[PDB]
């Protein structure tokens, strides 16, 4: 349902589970010439984003990835990240609610 | 109690005709801290309690 979203060097996509959606970051492994990998960026919040993710978006300038799920339509799930010297220095998962 | 649709009126005291006002809905900001426990790290960045 959700097209993978590319921000900078990374591509973010959803992998649904039985009850909650896991969001993964697709990236190129540093050492190997031609090996790509996916990293679960919701590993510490596996039961956060309900199944039904239909939009993955975000801003390169503001350094966030936003996920829209129809499991909880009132929330915009926000993934705030920072990259310094090829290192995730910030991994912030939260949601916005409007009513 | 029934909602804004049932009573869609905002009664402001006094005569405010011709004045510009700013209407919005309050944003409910929430942040719950993790429990204030002792945090230690190893030689690497891995944390421990």
């Amino acid at each position: 349902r959700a097209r993978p979203f590319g921000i900078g060097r990374n591509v973010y996509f959803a992998s649904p589970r039985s009850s909650f959606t896991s969001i993964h970051r697709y990236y190129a492994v540093q050492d190997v010439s031609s090996v790509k990998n996916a990293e679960d960026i919701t590993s510490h919040v596996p039961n956060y984003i309900p199944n039904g993710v239909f939009s993955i978006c975000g801003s390169g300038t503001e350094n966030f990835c936003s996920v829209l799920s129809h499991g909880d339509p009132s929330k915009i799930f926000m993934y705030k990240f920072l990259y310094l010297n090829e290192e995730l220095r910030q991994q912030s998962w939260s949601h916005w609610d409007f009513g | 109690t029934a909602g804004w649709n049932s009573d869609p009126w905002l009664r402001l005291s006094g005569n405010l005709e011709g004045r510009m006002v700013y209407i919005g809905f309050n944003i409910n900001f929430v942040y719950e801290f993790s429990k204030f426990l002792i945090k230690q790290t190893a030689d690497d960045g891995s944390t421990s309690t």
């Binding site: 679960d40 960026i41 590993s43 510490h44 995730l88 220095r89 910030q90 991994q91 912030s92 | 945090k39 230690q40 790290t41 960045g45 891995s46 944390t47």
Partner: peptide, 15 residues
């Protein structure tokens, strides 16, 4: 002289 806070660069994600 009480001990100082250990400098922890720490991290993020699952632990």
């Amino acid at each position: 002289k009480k001990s100082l806070s250990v400098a922890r660069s720490s991290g993020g994600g699952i632990n």
